[PDB]
């Protein structure tokens, strides 16, 4: 089992990433917001005595200079780590990062943006390809009771019984996208409510795990790697999560896949060594390791954490850190003095 | 001076309006959200022993069946009120309402929606016409120091000195509209931040009055009647507010004014008995009465109040009620049992 | 049914009483703390259009110049009230007050002090004599399941099942008094915890009604009139409360009853028209009216409300107001400007 | 400079100590409450890779089996630490502990109890003898403006100007002890307020450093080692603290010093190598090292942190951790699952 110290240091990782990204809040520059976050997250991780590999991040080493897929992070990745690192610290771990989950939200001062990461031992986090993903997220009472393969209407009926709430008081977060017109209409027809977001379905899935938030499920199609980070959260909190890769451009209806074809995408999946493109992944398959760590820090306001607030001489952050190793859910409000 | 009891009853007015509107949260129906709110606000006001006239509301008596301009509300508007009402309760008062400020926000589960009203004695609230309005809102330290007639860049410079904050840490809420491209760019060029909202500039202006919110000013062009409600808030809290009517379709660039002309609009202003179309209105001119009451209750989450939350058997509301008569700012968290 | 307006005005009654009492916080003068509270509560009640009679208060008209038993309060107690008051406002109501519950706590800066009152229609609040009272208070899950006639050990066993908590994690508030040595020891022997208070068993009983407080029951012997105010709270919140008068000086062991005898006290009870001195009163017997109102405002910090905080130019209060008529539990945080 | 990791691990040290001590909350056993705390604090510290020496603790090695003065704590105190520890981790540091500050408060369910520690590099924390100590604590605005050598009346006058508050709204915490009759009376005579506590003057001094608490100074005579822990807090937060040893039994008036004499105590001070018994120690002299760490976790409720709350399957803690090395003040709310 990995070093317990890591579950503490990641507090500072998401804090520093959030602070740096928040420096570009409402500046209208999604690139600078991402770059500051990515830079601050990496540098803080590279001060941890850990032996880490990025398995979800900014993109392939070609497509992304920093926190690329397969990048080594932590002091103990160094060739002579045996001089600086305990056996414990030498344990290999996989890391999924999203330094600024919802860069558009941070750029235009929109709620829902977070610095987020997940950690497990090697092989313990699914290395999702850069694909879309059908997601179903729901609270702990609903775990294994709802199912991604059910209709939205059936899932709401089940969720209603699980949470002991009328169906017309269930709140489903759905991403505002042309791909979701039918889904959205269905939820309405069922009698439930639809909370539309422009970006940031990770803070959405995470809200499902907590009572107090007025969020009871996430439905629809999001980005796959972000799905894995959400799954890691749910596994740690005992909430429901399932994901299924989406590869057909006719389903997702975006400009990103305007010059993509279903078959071309299928072959890309084969190249990734994915043999079952239609597979439904349980939370325990997406985050499958012995130990799961999850950390988040608010950039703009969300339902669980406030955004970063600056003041003369400093900043104030709110963070959520979850460890299956220490069995703790830890809310952290930090005043940073500059 | 009006009955002190009114400053208490309006707690229940905005609560009931918010609850009713929240029943349509995320239902995708901006009409039902408005109608429930309007209906619940009016009925709760009609149980108050007050002699009220609506001066800002849903529209003219022709254009709006409920809470129309000039509608009488309160038990003491009845012809035989002298049998039911104290002299005190017989005092004539003017009321500005927005039962669901940001109906689109409530319909699609977006932050920033509130049930809101303002009250003063007769003649004490400007009866704004259904026009656009250039608005400048800012915290109490900035009152009378910034000015609507200044450039955004000069106003930020001044605001910087007032709040003792670097300019690059000032947050200006601006409505996302084509009319604001130049304004938005200017604020960026100045070095400050722009928080874009899709609707709801009343909760924006109100956030300016409170430290803790990360909102330091509102700039740009909004709707005039909503401006008056915001001015009433600021006058009560001692925050800055100024408004100036906008009448030229080339400036506002909307489909609502696509078949409108500058001159046609100017003549409409004359018909309203407005002789100076270019007048800058101080907060004290928009809300000019001896006594000002202001009440708000969150429908969806904002920076000051949570949205309405429903649970098995009830709902929970958060409200803000301000009285220059009792000199109180009153935050109210209510659990309603059904 | 009484005027709904009263359930709003009492917010201001407990606020004003608390503020006035808080002016003597930590001044070491339990008399001034009481007198300011009593004075401020009465004056604010005398501005309500209600027809009230004090049935629990500072003492008999001889023993207490202000808020004495049988004193008339409210504008509609006046002989010519028919000129000022609606039929509704003319309804007769009984009021129980404790303007400063725990004057010693306020005098020495101790937690647990509150301004508190309860209202019902005439005959609806038991007019307890100035006697001690065995009390059992417990949360809603425990209502009618525990019983004052059971041993503390049996009641803890039952409470354990009701709240789904180990017995060694139940917290019983008990007053630190020689009369409770055996009771206290019993609770320990049972395995549970004892939270000792020096004064103020009303805020204790009220804490039992709320999850979040770490208080799960009140046991032991307190003052009877304060018991009735607590019962009114519980009936409104659906929590458990029972009371039984204690009249035997050998049981209570105080200096107040050093020159009292069991038989002399029994005869005093007869004079009050109490025929069953050993009667166990249900919550519904102590507060038996159709409508129950309950209001509290913190003077020093408690588990539900902060104490009054003063600042340059004003004060900040926190209040709890409960109405079976509007079916609302209402937490109120007020900033008062002077 | 010491390992930054230590400023994170101490979060868990005070949490574990608090949880263990809270298991005896309201059990009436000040010994078990202390022993659980002491045991849990030591064991959690002995899992940190640090090279620590206890300089303030349970007592001398003879008088106290656990966390005694001079005890080595941390993995890097081991003779072969060079095999397990970085140079950084091998740095010598001094630690002051109070695993349960106010054991009486925890035993009887009283507010004000905390698990607390302070850390600096070797020589950086004054090794106070087991003596009483005159203390003056006050907020940052008052730092170096008030003075322990002034009368309480002069200090209040100065504090009044510093905080911009009327003197009659200043709150001085003073310990309820016969030794303080004259002090207490003086503060009243000055016009200010006295908040009496039975134990726990560390949480009192710490409250002075924060606005929001209604505590503006600590005055009077407390225990010396606890004074040093408080000084460490103030130095980190920039609040005022001064201490002066009290050695004369006629001044302190306790049973602990009933068979002590002034001269006997003076000679004890000489044996400790203290040459100036009348010395006034600045905060920077009591906590004089380059780096200061301070950690606290609530056991029973205080003004900054809630006490430990238990629930079916776990506990919830609130902690405050301050580091001059990371320049952070960090509030931590942790849900522990068992
Ligand atoms: O290609 P589109 O239509 O934008 O959808 C991808 C979106 O990217 C985010 O919103 C942000 O990275 C992310 O939170 C979601 O996973 C979402 O699906
Ligand atoms: O005509 P558009 O371009 O929509 O602008 C009017 C908008 O209406 C609201 O957003 C909502 O009623 C309101 O909060 C604002 O005043 C705003 O200006
Ligand atoms: O006669 P004692 O031994 O003091 O007991 C009476 C006490 O009075 C209060 O503590 C305060 O009025 C009150 O909250 C309680 O009812 C308590 O019993
Ligand atoms: O000898 P007494 O009269 O008890 O005074 C010592 C007290 O011990 C504590 O209250 C608790 O350890 C501690 O918080 C204080 O320092 C206090 O002075
Ligand atoms: Mg990216
Ligand atoms: Mg991403
Ligand atoms: Mg996108
Ligand atoms: Mg409308
Ligand atoms: Mg409107
Ligand atoms: Mg519009
Ligand atoms: Mg009394
Ligand atoms: Mg009393
Ligand atoms: Mg007494
Ligand atoms: Mg000890
Ligand atoms: Mg101690
Ligand atoms: Mg002692």
Coordinates of C-alpha atoms in Angstrom, one line a residue, chain C residues 53-57 94-96 120-131 133 224-229 231-232 243-245 269 272-276 279 281-289:
Chain C
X53 CA -52.2 37.4 29.2
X54 CA -49.0 36.4 30.9
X55 CA -49.4 32.9 32.5
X56 CA -45.8 32.2 33.1
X57 CA -43.3 34.9 33.9
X94 CA -51.8 33.1 26.9
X95 CA -48.1 33.8 26.9
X96 CA -45.2 32.2 28.8
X120 CA -51.1 29.7 22.7
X121 CA -54.7 30.7 22.8
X122 CA -56.3 31.2 26.2
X123 CA -56.1 28.1 28.4
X124 CA -53.5 26.6 26.0
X125 CA -50.4 26.9 28.3
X126 CA -50.2 25.3 31.7
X127 CA -49.8 27.9 34.4
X128 CA -47.2 26.2 36.3
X129 CA -46.6 27.3 40.0
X130 CA -43.1 28.3 41.1
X131 CA -42.1 24.7 41.8
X133 CA -40.2 19.7 38.0
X224 CA -41.6 24.0 36.5
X225 CA -42.5 27.2 34.5
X226 CA -39.4 26.8 32.3
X227 CA -40.6 23.2 31.8
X228 CA -43.8 24.4 30.2
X229 CA -41.9 26.7 27.7
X231 CA -42.9 21.5 26.3
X232 CA -44.3 24.1 24.0
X243 CA -42.9 16.9 33.3
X244 CA -43.9 16.0 36.9
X245 CA -44.0 18.6 39.8
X269 CA -50.2 23.3 45.5
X272 CA -53.1 26.8 43.2
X273 CA -56.0 24.5 42.4
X274 CA -53.7 21.5 41.6
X275 CA -55.5 18.4 42.9
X276 CA -53.0 15.8 41.6
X279 CA -49.4 14.0 38.0
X281 CA -47.9 16.0 32.4
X282 CA -47.6 15.1 28.7
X283 CA -46.2 17.8 26.3
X284 CA -49.7 18.1 24.9
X285 CA -51.1 18.8 28.4
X286 CA -48.5 21.5 29.2
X287 CA -48.9 23.1 25.9
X288 CA -52.5 22.1 25.0
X289 CA -53.9 24.8 22.8

